Symmetry: D2
Subunit: 123 residues, 4 copies
Protein backbone atom coordinates (compact mmCIF):
# COMPACT_ATOMS: atom_id res chain seq x y z
CA UNK A 1 0.00 0.00 0.00
CA UNK A 2 2.93 2.28 -0.79
CA UNK A 3 1.15 3.18 -4.05
CA UNK A 4 -2.16 3.26 -2.20
CA UNK A 5 -0.97 5.78 0.38
CA UNK A 6 1.20 8.11 -1.74
CA UNK A 7 -0.67 11.16 -2.96
CA UNK A 8 -3.00 13.95 -1.95
CA UNK A 9 -5.67 13.43 0.69
CA UNK A 10 -8.40 15.62 2.13
CA UNK A 11 -10.18 15.42 5.46
CA UNK A 12 -13.70 16.38 6.60
CA UNK A 13 -12.56 19.91 7.62
CA UNK A 14 -11.06 20.62 4.17
CA UNK A 15 -7.44 20.16 5.25
CA UNK A 16 -4.87 18.85 2.69
CA UNK A 17 -2.43 16.02 3.48
CA UNK A 18 0.24 15.51 0.81
CA UNK A 19 2.30 12.37 1.50
CA UNK A 20 4.89 10.05 -0.01
CA UNK A 21 5.11 6.50 1.35
CA UNK A 22 8.67 5.16 1.04
CA UNK A 23 9.56 1.48 0.50
CA UNK A 24 11.31 1.52 3.91
CA UNK A 25 8.15 2.54 5.89
CA UNK A 26 8.68 6.33 5.84
CA UNK A 27 5.95 8.93 5.45
CA UNK A 28 7.08 12.40 4.31
CA UNK A 29 5.11 15.37 3.03
CA UNK A 30 3.18 18.49 3.94
CA UNK A 31 0.00 19.31 5.79
CA UNK A 32 -2.26 22.34 5.35
CA UNK A 33 -4.93 22.84 8.03
CA UNK A 34 -8.23 24.47 7.15
CA UNK A 35 -8.70 25.35 10.85
CA UNK A 36 -6.83 26.61 13.86
CA UNK A 37 -3.69 28.71 14.25
CA UNK A 38 -2.21 27.69 10.92
CA UNK A 39 -1.49 28.98 7.50
CA UNK A 40 0.02 27.42 4.41
CA UNK A 41 1.94 24.14 4.54
CA UNK A 42 3.77 22.44 7.41
CA UNK A 43 6.32 19.64 7.29
CA UNK A 44 5.14 16.19 8.29
CA UNK A 45 6.92 12.94 8.88
CA UNK A 46 5.71 9.56 9.99
CA UNK A 47 5.74 5.81 9.53
CA UNK A 48 3.51 3.08 8.11
CA UNK A 49 3.46 -0.74 8.04
CA UNK A 50 5.17 -1.52 4.74
CA UNK A 51 4.16 -5.23 4.92
CA UNK A 52 0.49 -5.24 6.08
CA UNK A 53 -1.49 -8.40 6.71
CA UNK A 54 -3.26 -9.92 3.69
CA UNK A 55 -6.44 -10.92 5.55
CA UNK A 56 -8.44 -7.75 4.73
CA UNK A 57 -7.05 -5.64 7.56
CA UNK A 58 -6.08 -2.02 7.15
CA UNK A 59 -2.51 -0.69 7.07
CA UNK A 60 -1.42 1.00 10.32
CA UNK A 61 0.28 4.37 10.10
CA UNK A 62 0.94 7.61 11.91
CA UNK A 63 2.46 11.02 11.38
CA UNK A 64 3.34 14.25 13.17
CA UNK A 65 3.12 17.96 12.33
CA UNK A 66 4.75 20.61 14.51
CA UNK A 67 2.83 23.81 13.84
CA UNK A 68 5.82 25.98 13.03
CA UNK A 69 6.53 27.20 9.51
CA UNK A 70 7.87 30.42 7.98
CA UNK A 71 4.56 32.20 8.63
CA UNK A 72 3.39 31.14 12.09
CA UNK A 73 4.33 29.21 15.18
CA UNK A 74 1.42 27.84 17.24
CA UNK A 75 3.77 26.13 19.75
CA UNK A 76 1.96 22.85 19.32
CA UNK A 77 2.14 19.49 17.54
CA UNK A 78 -0.47 17.04 16.28
CA UNK A 79 -0.02 13.30 15.80
CA UNK A 80 -2.43 11.26 13.74
CA UNK A 81 -2.68 7.53 14.42
CA UNK A 82 -4.78 5.39 12.13
CA UNK A 83 -5.10 2.95 9.29
CA UNK A 84 -5.32 3.08 5.54
CA UNK A 85 -8.17 1.12 3.97
CA UNK A 86 -7.69 0.44 0.27
CA UNK A 87 -10.32 0.13 -2.44
CA UNK A 88 -12.56 2.18 -4.71
CA UNK A 89 -13.24 4.71 -1.96
CA UNK A 90 -9.85 4.53 -0.24
CA UNK A 91 -9.73 6.07 3.20
CA UNK A 92 -7.32 6.86 5.99
CA UNK A 93 -9.20 6.74 9.30
CA UNK A 94 -7.37 8.47 12.15
CA UNK A 95 -7.54 9.68 15.70
CA UNK A 96 -5.30 12.56 16.67
CA UNK A 97 -3.68 14.23 19.68
CA UNK A 98 -2.83 17.94 19.55
CA UNK A 99 -0.47 18.96 22.34
CA UNK A 100 0.33 22.62 23.00
CA UNK A 101 3.36 23.73 24.97
CA UNK A 102 2.09 24.87 28.37
CA UNK A 103 3.32 25.83 31.80
CA UNK A 104 3.27 23.01 34.36
CA UNK A 105 0.22 24.71 35.95
CA UNK A 106 -1.74 24.45 32.68
CA UNK A 107 -0.47 21.03 31.54
CA UNK A 108 -3.77 19.36 32.42
CA UNK A 109 -5.34 21.33 29.49
CA UNK A 110 -2.46 20.81 27.06
CA UNK A 111 -3.91 18.12 24.79
CA UNK A 112 -6.90 18.10 22.38
CA UNK A 113 -8.17 14.82 20.93
CA UNK A 114 -10.20 14.29 17.82
CA UNK A 115 -10.73 12.15 14.72
CA UNK A 116 -10.10 12.86 11.03
CA UNK A 117 -11.10 10.73 8.02
CA UNK A 118 -9.14 11.36 4.80
CA UNK A 119 -10.34 10.60 1.27
CA UNK A 120 -8.74 10.92 -2.14
CA UNK A 121 -11.48 13.29 -3.30
CA UNK A 122 -12.55 16.37 -1.34
CA UNK A 123 -15.18 15.10 0.66
CA UNK B 1 15.74 22.66 23.24
CA UNK B 2 17.50 20.81 20.43
CA UNK B 3 20.29 20.00 22.92
CA UNK B 4 17.70 19.38 25.61
CA UNK B 5 15.80 16.79 23.56
CA UNK B 6 18.66 14.93 21.82
CA UNK B 7 19.72 11.80 23.66
CA UNK B 8 18.49 8.69 25.39
CA UNK B 9 15.22 8.65 27.31
CA UNK B 10 13.41 6.04 29.36
CA UNK B 11 9.74 5.73 30.22
CA UNK B 12 7.87 4.27 33.21
CA UNK B 13 7.58 0.82 31.53
CA UNK B 14 11.36 0.60 30.93
CA UNK B 15 11.18 1.38 27.22
CA UNK B 16 14.13 3.21 25.53
CA UNK B 17 13.66 6.21 23.24
CA UNK B 18 16.83 7.27 21.41
CA UNK B 19 16.32 10.56 19.54
CA UNK B 20 18.15 13.29 17.65
CA UNK B 21 16.48 16.70 17.40
CA UNK B 22 17.52 18.47 14.18
CA UNK B 23 17.83 22.26 13.80
CA UNK B 24 15.00 22.12 11.21
CA UNK B 25 12.42 20.57 13.64
CA UNK B 26 13.04 16.89 12.81
CA UNK B 27 13.04 14.03 15.30
CA UNK B 28 14.82 10.83 14.20
CA UNK B 29 15.90 7.78 16.16
CA UNK B 30 14.91 4.39 17.50
CA UNK B 31 12.43 3.04 20.00
CA UNK B 32 12.64 -0.18 22.02
CA UNK B 33 9.45 -1.22 23.83
CA UNK B 34 9.66 -3.15 27.08
CA UNK B 35 6.09 -4.40 26.50
CA UNK B 36 3.81 -5.70 23.80
CA UNK B 37 4.47 -7.45 20.48
CA UNK B 38 7.93 -5.97 20.02
CA UNK B 39 11.54 -6.86 20.11
CA UNK B 40 14.71 -4.85 19.62
CA UNK B 41 14.68 -1.40 18.03
CA UNK B 42 12.18 0.23 15.67
CA UNK B 43 12.61 3.32 13.50
CA UNK B 44 10.96 6.50 14.68
CA UNK B 45 10.46 9.87 13.11
CA UNK B 46 8.69 12.97 14.28
CA UNK B 47 8.70 16.72 14.72
CA UNK B 48 9.18 19.29 17.47
CA UNK B 49 8.80 23.08 17.88
CA UNK B 50 12.31 24.34 17.17
CA UNK B 51 11.45 27.87 18.42
CA UNK B 52 9.41 27.35 21.65
CA UNK B 53 7.94 30.19 23.67
CA UNK B 54 10.22 31.76 26.29
CA UNK B 55 7.51 32.21 28.96
CA UNK B 56 8.17 28.92 30.81
CA UNK B 57 6.05 26.74 28.55
CA UNK B 58 7.10 23.31 27.40
CA UNK B 59 8.23 22.42 23.87
CA UNK B 60 5.58 20.58 21.82
CA UNK B 61 6.62 17.46 19.94
CA UNK B 62 5.42 14.17 18.54
CA UNK B 63 6.71 11.02 16.91
CA UNK B 64 5.58 7.77 15.31
CA UNK B 65 6.77 4.16 15.41
CA UNK B 66 5.39 1.53 13.03
CA UNK B 67 5.92 -1.80 14.77
CA UNK B 68 7.71 -3.53 11.91
CA UNK B 69 11.41 -4.34 12.04
CA UNK B 70 13.60 -7.23 10.87
CA UNK B 71 12.35 -9.44 13.72
CA UNK B 72 8.61 -8.83 14.03
CA UNK B 73 5.64 -7.09 12.49
CA UNK B 74 2.78 -6.25 14.87
CA UNK B 75 0.76 -4.52 12.11
CA UNK B 76 0.33 -1.45 14.25
CA UNK B 77 1.70 2.06 14.85
CA UNK B 78 1.96 4.29 17.91
CA UNK B 79 2.10 8.09 17.94
CA UNK B 80 3.24 10.01 20.97
CA UNK B 81 2.09 13.61 21.37
CA UNK B 82 3.51 15.68 24.18
CA UNK B 83 5.88 18.31 25.45
CA UNK B 84 9.44 18.49 26.63
CA UNK B 85 10.01 20.24 29.96
CA UNK B 86 13.60 21.30 30.52
CA UNK B 87 15.51 21.54 33.79
CA UNK B 88 17.36 19.46 36.36
CA UNK B 89 14.85 16.63 36.06
CA UNK B 90 14.03 17.05 32.36
CA UNK B 91 10.93 15.23 31.21
CA UNK B 92 8.95 14.48 28.09
CA UNK B 93 5.28 14.08 29.04
CA UNK B 94 3.20 12.33 26.38
CA UNK B 95 -0.11 10.80 25.51
CA UNK B 96 -0.15 8.12 22.84
CA UNK B 97 -2.43 6.39 20.36
CA UNK B 98 -1.66 2.83 19.24
CA UNK B 99 -3.63 1.85 16.15
CA UNK B 100 -3.64 -1.74 14.87
CA UNK B 101 -4.64 -2.66 11.34
CA UNK B 102 -8.09 -4.24 11.57
CA UNK B 103 -10.97 -5.35 9.41
CA UNK B 104 -13.77 -2.80 9.04
CA UNK B 105 -15.87 -4.98 11.40
CA UNK B 106 -13.25 -4.66 14.16
CA UNK B 107 -12.23 -1.03 13.55
CA UNK B 108 -14.11 0.17 16.64
CA UNK B 109 -11.45 -1.71 18.74
CA UNK B 110 -8.46 -0.64 16.65
CA UNK B 111 -6.95 2.06 18.89
CA UNK B 112 -5.39 1.94 22.38
CA UNK B 113 -4.69 5.17 24.28
CA UNK B 114 -2.28 5.74 27.09
CA UNK B 115 0.31 8.07 28.61
CA UNK B 116 4.11 7.77 28.91
CA UNK B 117 6.50 10.03 30.84
CA UNK B 118 10.16 9.92 29.76
CA UNK B 119 13.15 10.86 31.90
CA UNK B 120 16.87 11.03 31.22
CA UNK B 121 17.58 8.47 33.95
CA UNK B 122 15.79 5.13 34.19
CA UNK B 123 13.06 5.90 36.31
CA UNK C 1 -32.35 20.38 25.54
CA UNK C 2 -33.93 18.05 28.09
CA UNK C 3 -36.65 17.32 25.51
CA UNK C 4 -34.03 17.27 22.77
CA UNK C 5 -31.90 14.62 24.49
CA UNK C 6 -34.57 12.31 25.96
CA UNK C 7 -35.36 9.36 23.73
CA UNK C 8 -33.88 6.61 21.63
CA UNK C 9 -30.62 7.10 19.73
CA UNK C 10 -28.60 4.94 17.39
CA UNK C 11 -24.92 5.07 16.51
CA UNK C 12 -22.95 4.17 13.37
CA UNK C 13 -22.35 0.57 14.60
CA UNK C 14 -26.09 -0.05 15.15
CA UNK C 15 -25.96 0.26 18.93
CA UNK C 16 -29.05 1.59 20.82
CA UNK C 17 -28.83 4.32 23.48
CA UNK C 18 -32.07 4.85 25.40
CA UNK C 19 -31.85 7.90 27.68
CA UNK C 20 -33.90 10.21 29.89
CA UNK C 21 -32.54 13.69 30.58
CA UNK C 22 -33.71 14.94 33.99
CA UNK C 23 -34.35 18.61 34.85
CA UNK C 24 -31.50 18.39 37.41
CA UNK C 25 -28.81 17.39 34.82
CA UNK C 26 -29.10 13.60 35.18
CA UNK C 27 -28.86 11.09 32.35
CA UNK C 28 -30.35 7.64 33.02
CA UNK C 29 -31.17 4.77 30.68
CA UNK C 30 -29.89 1.67 28.93
CA UNK C 31 -27.31 0.88 26.29
CA UNK C 32 -27.25 -2.07 23.88
CA UNK C 33 -23.99 -2.59 21.97
CA UNK C 34 -24.05 -4.09 18.50
CA UNK C 35 -20.38 -5.09 18.94
CA UNK C 36 -17.98 -6.52 21.47
CA UNK C 37 -18.46 -8.72 24.53
CA UNK C 38 -22.03 -7.62 25.15
CA UNK C 39 -25.55 -8.81 24.93
CA UNK C 40 -28.88 -7.17 25.66
CA UNK C 41 -29.15 -3.95 27.68
CA UNK C 42 -26.79 -2.42 30.23
CA UNK C 43 -27.48 0.32 32.77
CA UNK C 44 -26.12 3.76 32.02
CA UNK C 45 -25.91 6.93 34.00
CA UNK C 46 -24.43 10.29 33.25
CA UNK C 47 -24.77 14.06 33.29
CA UNK C 48 -25.50 16.90 30.87
CA UNK C 49 -25.45 20.73 30.95
CA UNK C 50 -29.05 21.58 31.79
CA UNK C 51 -28.51 25.30 31.01
CA UNK C 52 -26.45 25.38 27.75
CA UNK C 53 -25.25 28.57 26.12
CA UNK C 54 -27.67 30.25 23.70
CA UNK C 55 -25.03 31.26 21.13
CA UNK C 56 -25.41 28.19 18.87
CA UNK C 57 -23.09 25.94 20.85
CA UNK C 58 -23.83 22.31 21.55
CA UNK C 59 -24.86 20.88 24.93
CA UNK C 60 -22.04 19.04 26.75
CA UNK C 61 -22.79 15.63 28.21
CA UNK C 62 -21.30 12.31 29.19
CA UNK C 63 -22.30 8.88 30.40
CA UNK C 64 -20.88 5.57 31.59
CA UNK C 65 -21.75 1.90 31.02
CA UNK C 66 -20.13 -0.88 33.06
CA UNK C 67 -20.37 -3.99 30.91
CA UNK C 68 -21.98 -6.22 33.51
CA UNK C 69 -25.60 -7.33 33.26
CA UNK C 70 -27.52 -10.52 34.04
CA UNK C 71 -26.09 -12.23 30.94
CA UNK C 72 -22.43 -11.27 30.73
CA UNK C 73 -19.62 -9.49 32.50
CA UNK C 74 -16.85 -8.10 30.26
CA UNK C 75 -14.98 -6.56 33.23
CA UNK C 76 -14.83 -3.22 31.50
CA UNK C 77 -16.51 0.20 31.34
CA UNK C 78 -16.98 2.77 28.59
CA UNK C 79 -17.45 6.51 29.04
CA UNK C 80 -18.77 8.69 26.26
CA UNK C 81 -17.95 12.40 26.33
CA UNK C 82 -19.56 14.68 23.80
CA UNK C 83 -22.16 17.24 22.86
CA UNK C 84 -25.73 17.25 21.69
CA UNK C 85 -26.47 19.35 18.61
CA UNK C 86 -30.14 20.15 18.16
CA UNK C 87 -32.09 20.64 14.94
CA UNK C 88 -33.76 18.73 12.12
CA UNK C 89 -31.01 16.12 12.07
CA UNK C 90 -30.20 16.15 15.79
CA UNK C 91 -26.95 14.48 16.72
CA UNK C 92 -24.89 13.52 19.73
CA UNK C 93 -21.21 13.57 18.76
CA UNK C 94 -18.97 11.68 21.19
CA UNK C 95 -15.54 10.35 21.88
CA UNK C 96 -15.25 7.37 24.19
CA UNK C 97 -12.80 5.54 26.45
CA UNK C 98 -13.25 1.81 27.10
CA UNK C 99 -11.18 0.63 30.05
CA UNK C 100 -10.85 -3.08 30.86
CA UNK C 101 -9.76 -4.35 34.25
CA UNK C 102 -6.18 -5.58 33.85
CA UNK C 103 -3.21 -6.69 35.86
CA UNK C 104 -0.64 -3.97 36.57
CA UNK C 105 1.63 -5.64 33.97
CA UNK C 106 -1.02 -5.21 31.26
CA UNK C 107 -2.35 -1.78 32.32
CA UNK C 108 -0.61 -0.05 29.41
CA UNK C 109 -3.10 -1.87 27.07
CA UNK C 110 -6.16 -1.34 29.27
CA UNK C 111 -7.92 1.47 27.38
CA UNK C 112 -9.48 1.67 23.89
CA UNK C 113 -10.47 5.03 22.41
CA UNK C 114 -12.94 5.74 19.68
CA UNK C 115 -15.73 8.00 18.46
CA UNK C 116 -19.49 7.41 18.10
CA UNK C 117 -22.08 9.68 16.45
CA UNK C 118 -25.71 9.12 17.50
CA UNK C 119 -28.79 10.04 15.47
CA UNK C 120 -32.50 9.80 16.15
CA UNK C 121 -33.00 7.55 13.12
CA UNK C 122 -30.92 4.44 12.47
CA UNK C 123 -28.28 5.71 10.47
CA UNK D 1 -14.55 -3.56 45.82
CA UNK D 2 -17.66 -1.67 46.87
CA UNK D 3 -15.95 -1.03 50.23
CA UNK D 4 -12.67 -0.43 48.43
CA UNK D 5 -14.10 2.28 46.17
CA UNK D 6 -16.45 4.13 48.56
CA UNK D 7 -14.85 7.15 50.17
CA UNK D 8 -12.78 10.24 49.54
CA UNK D 9 -10.08 10.30 46.86
CA UNK D 10 -7.57 12.88 45.73
CA UNK D 11 -5.79 13.26 42.41
CA UNK D 12 -2.39 14.66 41.42
CA UNK D 13 -3.84 18.18 40.85
CA UNK D 14 -5.37 18.31 44.35
CA UNK D 15 -8.94 17.68 43.21
CA UNK D 16 -11.38 15.83 45.56
CA UNK D 17 -13.56 12.92 44.41
CA UNK D 18 -16.16 11.84 46.97
CA UNK D 19 -17.94 8.65 45.88
CA UNK D 20 -20.30 5.93 47.07
CA UNK D 21 -20.22 2.59 45.27
CA UNK D 22 -23.65 0.91 45.39
CA UNK D 23 -24.20 -2.87 45.45
CA UNK D 24 -25.97 -2.56 42.07
CA UNK D 25 -22.92 -1.03 40.25
CA UNK D 26 -23.78 2.66 40.77
CA UNK D 27 -21.30 5.43 41.51
CA UNK D 28 -22.72 8.61 43.07
CA UNK D 29 -21.01 11.56 44.73
CA UNK D 30 -19.37 14.93 44.23
CA UNK D 31 -16.28 16.25 42.52
CA UNK D 32 -14.29 19.39 43.36
CA UNK D 33 -11.70 20.45 40.77
CA UNK D 34 -8.55 22.25 41.87
CA UNK D 35 -8.17 23.62 38.32
CA UNK D 36 -10.16 25.08 35.48
CA UNK D 37 -13.48 26.93 35.34
CA UNK D 38 -14.85 25.38 38.51
CA UNK D 39 -15.66 26.16 42.05
CA UNK D 40 -17.01 24.08 44.92
CA UNK D 41 -18.63 20.69 44.36
CA UNK D 42 -20.32 19.22 41.28
CA UNK D 43 -22.62 16.21 41.04
CA UNK D 44 -21.14 13.03 39.62
CA UNK D 45 -22.63 9.73 38.61
CA UNK D 46 -21.14 6.65 37.08
CA UNK D 47 -20.83 2.88 37.07
CA UNK D 48 -18.36 0.20 38.14
CA UNK D 49 -17.97 -3.58 37.73
CA UNK D 50 -19.59 -4.92 40.89
CA UNK D 51 -18.26 -8.47 40.25
CA UNK D 52 -14.61 -8.01 39.12
CA UNK D 53 -12.37 -10.88 38.11
CA UNK D 54 -10.45 -12.61 40.92
CA UNK D 55 -7.20 -13.08 38.96
CA UNK D 56 -5.48 -9.88 40.19
CA UNK D 57 -7.07 -7.56 37.65
CA UNK D 58 -8.35 -4.12 38.50
CA UNK D 59 -12.02 -3.13 38.73
CA UNK D 60 -13.28 -1.15 35.71
CA UNK D 61 -15.27 2.01 36.35
CA UNK D 62 -16.22 5.38 34.96
CA UNK D 63 -18.04 8.55 35.91
CA UNK D 64 -19.21 11.89 34.54
CA UNK D 65 -19.31 15.47 35.84
CA UNK D 66 -21.18 18.22 34.00
CA UNK D 67 -19.54 21.46 35.08
CA UNK D 68 -22.71 23.25 36.14
CA UNK D 69 -23.50 23.94 39.79
CA UNK D 70 -25.11 26.81 41.71
CA UNK D 71 -21.97 28.95 41.31
CA UNK D 72 -20.74 28.44 37.75
CA UNK D 73 -21.52 26.84 34.43
CA UNK D 74 -18.51 26.00 32.23
CA UNK D 75 -20.72 24.43 29.52
CA UNK D 76 -18.62 21.29 29.53
CA UNK D 77 -18.50 17.72 30.88
CA UNK D 78 -15.67 15.37 31.82
CA UNK D 79 -15.79 11.58 31.83
CA UNK D 80 -13.20 9.52 33.62
CA UNK D 81 -12.62 5.94 32.48
CA UNK D 82 -10.33 3.72 34.49
CA UNK D 83 -9.78 0.98 37.01
CA UNK D 84 -9.55 0.65 40.74
CA UNK D 85 -6.53 -1.24 42.07
CA UNK D 86 -6.93 -2.41 45.64
CA UNK D 87 -4.27 -2.83 48.32
CA UNK D 88 -2.20 -0.90 50.83
CA UNK D 89 -1.77 2.01 48.43
CA UNK D 90 -5.14 1.75 46.68
CA UNK D 91 -5.41 3.70 43.46
CA UNK D 92 -7.90 4.62 40.78
CA UNK D 93 -6.03 5.09 37.50
CA UNK D 94 -8.02 7.00 34.88
CA UNK D 95 -7.98 8.65 31.51
CA UNK D 96 -10.47 11.43 30.90
CA UNK D 97 -12.24 13.31 28.12
CA UNK D 98 -13.42 16.89 28.71
CA UNK D 99 -15.87 18.04 26.06
CA UNK D 100 -17.00 21.67 25.86
CA UNK D 101 -20.13 22.75 24.04
CA UNK D 102 -18.98 24.42 20.81
CA UNK D 103 -20.31 25.69 17.53
CA UNK D 104 -20.02 23.24 14.63
CA UNK D 105 -17.15 25.38 13.28
CA UNK D 106 -15.16 24.89 16.51
CA UNK D 107 -16.11 21.25 17.20
CA UNK D 108 -12.68 20.00 16.12
CA UNK D 109 -11.27 21.72 19.29
CA UNK D 110 -14.08 20.64 21.62
CA UNK D 111 -12.39 17.82 23.55
CA UNK D 112 -9.40 17.76 25.94
CA UNK D 113 -7.84 14.45 26.98
CA UNK D 114 -5.75 13.71 30.01
CA UNK D 115 -5.01 11.25 32.81
CA UNK D 116 -5.68 11.43 36.56
CA UNK D 117 -4.49 9.04 39.28
CA UNK D 118 -6.47 9.08 42.55
CA UNK D 119 -5.19 7.98 45.95
CA UNK D 120 -6.80 7.73 49.37
CA UNK D 121 -4.27 10.16 50.84
CA UNK D 122 -3.49 13.54 49.29
CA UNK D 123 -0.76 12.77 47.16
CL1 LIG E 1 -16.91 11.37 12.79
CL1 LIG F 1 0.53 8.29 35.13
CL1 LIG G 1 -16.01 9.03 12.02
CL1 LIG H 1 1.22 10.78 34.67
Amino acid sequence: DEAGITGTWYNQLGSTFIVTAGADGALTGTYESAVGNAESRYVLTGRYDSAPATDGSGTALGWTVAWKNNYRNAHSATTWSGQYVGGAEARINTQWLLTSGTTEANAWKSTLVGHDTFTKVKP
